[PDB]
Structure formats: C-alpha cells, structure tokens
Amino acid sequence: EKDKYALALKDKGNQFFRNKKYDDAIKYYNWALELKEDPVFYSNLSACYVSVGDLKKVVEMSTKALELKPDYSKVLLRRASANEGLGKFADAMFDLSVLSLNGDFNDASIEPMLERNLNKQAMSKLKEKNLPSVTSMASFFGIFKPELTFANYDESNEADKELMNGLSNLYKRSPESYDKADESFTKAARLFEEQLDKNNEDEKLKEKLAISLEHTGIFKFLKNDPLGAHEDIKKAIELFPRVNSYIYMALIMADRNDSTEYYNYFDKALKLDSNNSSVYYHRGQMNFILQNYDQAGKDFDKAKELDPENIFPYIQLACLAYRENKFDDCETLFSEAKRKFPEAPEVPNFFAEILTDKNDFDKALKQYDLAIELENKLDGIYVGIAPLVGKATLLTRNPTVENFIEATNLLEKASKLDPRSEQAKIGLAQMKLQQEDIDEAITLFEESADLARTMEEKLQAITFAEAAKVQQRIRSDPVLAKKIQET
Amino acid sequence: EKDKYALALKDKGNQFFRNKKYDDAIKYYNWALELKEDPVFYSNLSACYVSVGDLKKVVEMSTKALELKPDYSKVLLRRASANEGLGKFADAMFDLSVLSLNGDFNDASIEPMLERNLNKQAMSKLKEKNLPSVTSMASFFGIFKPELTFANYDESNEADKELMNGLSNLYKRSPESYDKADESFTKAARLFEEQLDKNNEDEKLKEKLAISLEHTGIFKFLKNDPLGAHEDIKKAIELFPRVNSYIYMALIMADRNDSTEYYNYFDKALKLDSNNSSVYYHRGQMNFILQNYDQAGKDFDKAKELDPENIFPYIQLACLAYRENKFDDCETLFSEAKRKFPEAPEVPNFFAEILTDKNDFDKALKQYDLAIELENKLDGIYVGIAPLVGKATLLTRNPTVENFIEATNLLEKASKLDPRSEQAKIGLAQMKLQQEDIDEAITLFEESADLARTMEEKLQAITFAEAAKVQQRIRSDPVLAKKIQET
C-alpha cells in the first residue's frame, strides 16, 4: 500500500506547489519517487522547476518523465521550451518536430514556435559565419579621456564655438547630448572648411578643422558606410595627425578586408602620445578579436597602467579569461573590479550578461538589477538601456503569465529612453506577438526592421512581420478565426 | 436527372487525362460542368491545368472547387503550391495555414512548405526596402569595346607584358580567362608602380599604371567593397584621367550613399571622348535606376547611334518600357533586336527573364531554349549559365515528376560550368531537398552559403540547411521515421 502514501505525498506536494511554496513540493515528489517511479512525479517536478526558473533541471526531469512515458506532450512541449531557454535551438526544434507528428497537437499553435527557434538557430549559425542606440554611443566613447579644450580656443568665431558645443555634448553623457554633438560637429566642419579658403596656408585653422573632421567621420562611421568616414578622418590626418584619428582609422580599415597596416596606425598614433592609454586598449580589442587571447590581455595591462581609473581596461581582461574557459579567473577578476569601482554600472551589467551566457540565471538576474541600481543612481548615462533589455531577456527566457509582464514592462520602458534601440523594439514585438496582439506585434517588427543595423537583422524582422501578417489574415472572419480560438 | 451523362463525360474525360491527353480531358470535364456543377469536376479540371503548367488557371479551377467544398484538402494543397509557382507566397502561406486548421492534416509535412514560402516572401519584401561568377562578370564587361593594345607597348618590361597579357584575358571571353586577368592586373600594377617610383614625371609610366590600377580597381569593386576600388581607380584618375575610369568611379560611388558628384563624373568622362558609347549607356543606367525612365531612354538612343552594333543599348530600351507598363512596345522592341542580331544569346535570355516576370511561362520557356541554343553556336562565353538556371527555375516553377528532373539536370550542368554561381547551387539544394535527399541537400545548402554574395542570402541558405538538419535527425530511429513515411 506504498501507493497509498505515494499518492498521499504527491497530493500533499501538489498543495506545497499550489501556494507557490515550490521548494517544498519538490521534496514530496522526490520521496514519492522512492515508493513508485511514476512519470507524473517527474512531470510534476519539471513543472515546478519551471516556476523556479531552473531550466537545466526542467530538461532533466522532463526527460526522465518521457523516458518512462513517450506519449507525454504536456512534458515534451515543456522540454521544447526549456531547451529554447538554454538557447539549445536545435533540440528545441527536434522536440517540437517530434511533437508535430506524434500527438495530434499541431495546428498554428506549435508552427510559430518552430519558426522562432529555426530563426534564432539560423541567425546564430550565421554569426559563426541614422545614429545607433544612445546606450551604445556611451559605451563607445567611454574609453577616451574627455576633451574639452582644443588650442587657440574660439574668438568671436561661430565655427570655433560650434566645435566647443559638439565637443562638449560629445562627452557629458546625458540623452540627446550625442545627437547634439553630431550636428554641431558637422557644422563646425562646414565653417572651418570655408574659413580655410581665406587662409589656405593657416596652421590654427587646419588643427581646428582637423579635430572638427576627426569627429565628423567618426559619427559617419557610426552611421552608414565607412565611405565618408574614411575621407573625413583621412583628410584629418593630412591636416594634423591627432591620436584618436589613427585609432578611428585603424577601425574603418579593420572594418573590412584585411591590411595589417592599421596595426601600424596605432603605432602612428603612439608617435604622438606614447602613453595614450586608449590606444593600448583598442590594440587589445583587435588582438582580442584576432582570437589572439594573449597579446590582447597584454595591451590591456598597459591600458590599465596608463589609466587605472578607466573601468574598461579592467572589464575587458576581467572575463576575457571566459573566452578561455577560465570562469575561475573571471568570476573573481570581475569581483576585483566589482569592488574597486563600486559605483560603476558596467561591471554589474557585463558580468551579468556573462553569467547569463554561462547559464547562471539565478545570479545573472541579480547582477542586472544591481547594474540597474548603480545606473540611475548617477545622473550620467553609463550602461543605459542595456540592463533593462538584458534583464527582460533572461526573463522571457522562461515564459510566465507573470514573468512576461515584468519583461514587457522593462522593454517598454527601455524602448522609450532609447527609441533608436531595435534590441528593445523586437523584444516588445516578440512579446506583443505572443500576447495574441499579432496586429500590434506586426507594427513593432516592421519598425524593428527600420531600426535594424544590417540586412540580416532586417531580414530577420521582416520574416516575423510577414509570418504575423499571414496570421493576421487568417484571424479574419469568425468562420476561420473562431476556429483558431479553440485552444 | 441527367447525372448519368455527367458521370460518363467525367469517366470518359478521366480516360483522356490518363492518356496524357490533357487538352482532351479538360473538354469532357468542361462539358460535364454543363450538366452538373460538381466540385470534383473543377478539381480534375484543375489537375489538368497543372500538368499543362498553366498555373493561373490552376488557382482558378482550384478556387471554384473550394467555393463548393471548402474542406477539399487536395485542391487547397494544390492551389498553395500553385500560388508559390506564381510568386504569390503570402497566399501560398495562407492556404497552407488553413490546410492546417480546416483539413484534418495531422502531419507536419506542411511546416517545411510554409517555411519555404515564408522565406521566399520575407526575402522579396526585404529586397524592396573571391571574384563573383564567370557568367556574371562576362555580362558586366560585355558593354565595353575590347581593348587589346595600349600606347607605348613594351620595350621588354615585364609590367608591360603583364598589362597586355591582362587585357588579353580580360576579353577573349572563356572561363578562367578572368581569374588570370585579375591576377595579371594586380601584378602589372605593382611593377609599373615600382617603376613610376623611379621616374615620377614619366607620362608613359603614369598612363600604364593608370590603366593598370583602373582594372585592378574595378576588379576589387567586384571581389567586393568599393573601399579598395575607389582608392585604386581614384589614383588612376590622378595619374592619367581616362574615360573608362570615370565610369567605374560613378559606379563605385553610386553604390555608397548620395553624391552630387557621381553624376558629374559622367560629364568629366564625356570631355574626353564625347562620342563614346559606353558612357551614355551607363548614364542611362543611373537614370534607369533613379526611376528617371525619361532621360533613361534619351541616353540610350544616343548610345545606340555611337555604336549601333552593340546589342545592350537595344536590350535596355528593349524593355525600359516594361518598367513603364507599356508591354507591347517592349515586345516589338525585343523583336526588332531579336532579328537584327539574330545570333546574340543576350536578347533571347533577357527576353526570357522578362516573359517570365509577366508569367508567360510558355513563350519564355522557348525563349530560353532559343538562347541556350545561340549560346552554344559560339566559342566565347557571353550569356553563360544564365539560360540554364533560367529555364531550370521556370521549370521547377511547377514541380512535376518530369519538371524536377529537367531542371535538376540543367543545374547539375549549370554548376559544372560555373561553380561560383550561387543560384545553381541552391537550385540543386532545393531539389535534393524535395528529392528526399537530405544529407546531400544540407551540403548543397551549406555550400550555397559560402558562395552567397551578401549576408542577406547567407542567412537564407543557412536557414534551409538548418531546417534540413533537424529534419534529418528526425528521420532517424524509425520508431519516428516510419510515421513520417505514412504521407
């Protein structure tokens, strides 16, 4: 009569589950398994682990369950979703594909799930191969020492003033500050460029128009093609070197094709500022992307020495060891910088995304919130929308009647502070699409498209949009639409 | 009562159909529709039109059948594959979706169909918002009058020999001839540079290097990325102008973003050989793309006068009217040229690509065979694999036991000749895919990725390959594979 208390335990557990006291139920299920190895006990296990957010467990218990009872859609579909959470798209489609056959589920219910997974899978494999978000600008210019001077500063000259305006709006974080710097920089370029013809052989004018263009091209780089970005900073070098010019040049080239010439541009830069710690940081990134995980973290040390205050030289090395499966050196190295600059939102935010990767959902979730705190705690901008979107991500990673609102809440906000952020836009479109608001979902995807940086990301957005449009066309007239409602 | 006859007419009609007498069957099926307007009649009547490759009709007889029996899975299915045949993917997906609801089709065999149509669609909307392939390059240069000799040729100098050997291979059509040209122009450019460095003011070395760089340049604008092409042909224009270089500039420039200069480049060219044909032909291209359907034509006629022997000026205007709805004009215009250069494969191939756009799979199918003919009645290369894949497409444009074997061959050959042409590759992949040849299809796809020009197509080829991968893994352990066989 063990089944008596086998059944008894289950039920008693079902309650410890009912009142959200999940941690409790699990036990009663684990011990009820001692009496009888009934699949339902595993199904119930995987079920609660979901509410807890433990996906690797959900995928285990779910398997054990199926292993004793193949015909178990309620479970298989759960593993299909749990797999998607762990980012295991291939398995996600396998479970779904096996599901589309066996049980008679099918219908426009699981079809979209496959599409989404296939999508993420393709986009992922592919990766082994107007101005962008404000939160990116900030992370891009954060490695440089903020300029605010520039010699022979102004006169009652409008050009010299525009330069100051933009050069001021460049740094100083704050929203719109970046867009402001852009327009003023370009204008400063128009003027000087004009004044230069009145003094074709002027020194102070070239230097001014030099730094003026040195910035116009960088924003162009951040904008469309490196076409203009080149001629601009190139002419800038011709007018007057300037460290940043070379560094920027070394990117517009490393951008495409190959020419180990830029690894010499840094050198051309050092020719001026032999200790311009920003250079050693970038040379570290290039060597870091060149799979050269050594010389990379070698330059960084020089970046940290020639400027300990700069947080990035730490963040890079921090978990660089992660791309070297040295989670040990990482987890602690991040901590070193996690308390050395106990006010910097970066560490919390980045270390967070890395914990999310290594699948430490329980921790990476806390880290983001920490970043979100230290973030708005300062009137700057550092790690802007990043945390909000980054958080909603690992959340949606586990769809929940509740959890989904938390995310859609975060994304909605995020997409308001940084409208130029597609990462946020698609997020919502994805959300509103699951919320049967296909109509709303479409508009978002469509817009997400416009915001997307490259064609691949654009092709991604349109597919959904299109898949949604066909869904929208089907959900017309109750004659067919109502038929879909039966769920 | 009279159904006795309708049945007879049908039965008798079913006989003519069973005897490949398709145009014969439709007759009795059509008279049967005079007595009794039965669904099975429209159905069968549509089954004919399919074998007769009359897609438009298929959608028709297929719809009216549904309008009398909405739960006609077979017909619905057919109309879906019919629509996709006419490039109407949206509808194709709509039909397939309903077939998932309405029809009790529990299978999952609709999924891959939706994802194909979806994919095709997604790319179609996205579009409206290593050297290339031999057959492609062969067309690009096809507008320039051969250049076999340059001034002050050789003294012994290797550079001069190289430049010549280069120009030689440039034209001469034939595959591999290009790979060598590219390889020579770069070598010729090098040498002539080392030499021009010995004598800055030698106008002979300048000219040589100019035409040397110019050619290396345009090739770079094909191996992809104007960054390197622009600088090369730019220096070629600073050393010694040269009409042909200005044209390439306006092209590398028109590629990037707006430029009130890439228009002035043509005029600069003109200042050299005002009565040059190519120039006006390209200026007509820009005006043609700039929707400037107006001036787009004036520039061609003026380009046709300066070289009536050139086919291209004709082929363009030949349908610059099509883009201007005026079809008939494009017809006589294609005729006018078809019989003024009745040996050129171009006219026939560029007519076929058009006839197909208008859904004239009939005259277009022939127009291909025609071009495929005149093509072989030559030794050069001219219209390369275009005709093959061309008819291979319009062929699979209606999946038939016969159709999928005709095109499949055409592609096998198409790839044999032009191993670069990505189209040929995916074509097979698509075939191998349906041919129930998964692993092979996956390979062809994976390969199609490596050859795809832009990440745009890259992600596409990977999508399929990935879908295929999951499909394969499923068709394993027959406790799952068997069920898949019950189609």
Swiss-Prot record, chains A, B:
Phosphoserine-modified residues are where? S81
Q: Where in the cell is it found?
A: Mitochondrion outer membrane
Function comment: Component of the TOM (translocase of outer membrane) receptor complex responsible for the recognition and translocation of cytosolically synthesized mitochondrial preproteins. Together with TOM20 and TOM22 functions as the transit peptide receptor at the surface of the mitochondrion outer membrane and facilitates the movement of preproteins into the TOM40 translocation pore.
Q: According to the UniProt record, what happens if one changes N157H?
A: In strain: YJM1129
Please describe the quaternary structure of this protein.
Forms part of the TOM (translocase of outer membrane) complex that consists of at least 7 different proteins (TOM5, TOM6, TOM7, TOM20, TOM22, TOM40 and TOM70). In the complex interacts with TOM22. Interacts with TOM37.
Q: What is this protein called?
A: Mitochondrial import receptor subunit TOM70
Q: Where are the TPR repeats?
A: 6-39, 41-72, 161-195, 243-276, 277-310, 312-344, 345-378, 385-421, 422-455
Positions on the Cytoplasmic side per record topology: 1-487
Alphabetical GO CC annotations of the entry are:
mitochondria-associated endoplasmic reticulum membrane contact site; mitochondrial outer membrane; mitochondrial outer membrane translocase complex; mitochondrion
Lineage, highest ranks first: Eukaryota, Fungi, Dikarya, Ascomycota, Saccharomycotina
Keywords assigned by UniProt, alphabetized: Membrane, Mitochondrion, Mitochondrion outer membrane, Phosphoprotein, Repeat, TPR repeat, Transmembrane, Transmembrane helix
- Protein's membrane topology: Single-pass membrane protein
Additional comment: Present with 45300 molecules/cell in log phase SD medium.
Provide a GO biological process annotation. protein insertion into mitochondrial outer membrane
Q: Which GO terms describe its molecular function?
A: mitochondrion targeting sequence binding; protein-transporting ATPase activity
| Similarity comment | Belongs to the Tom70 family.
- Domain of life (superkingdom): Eukaryota
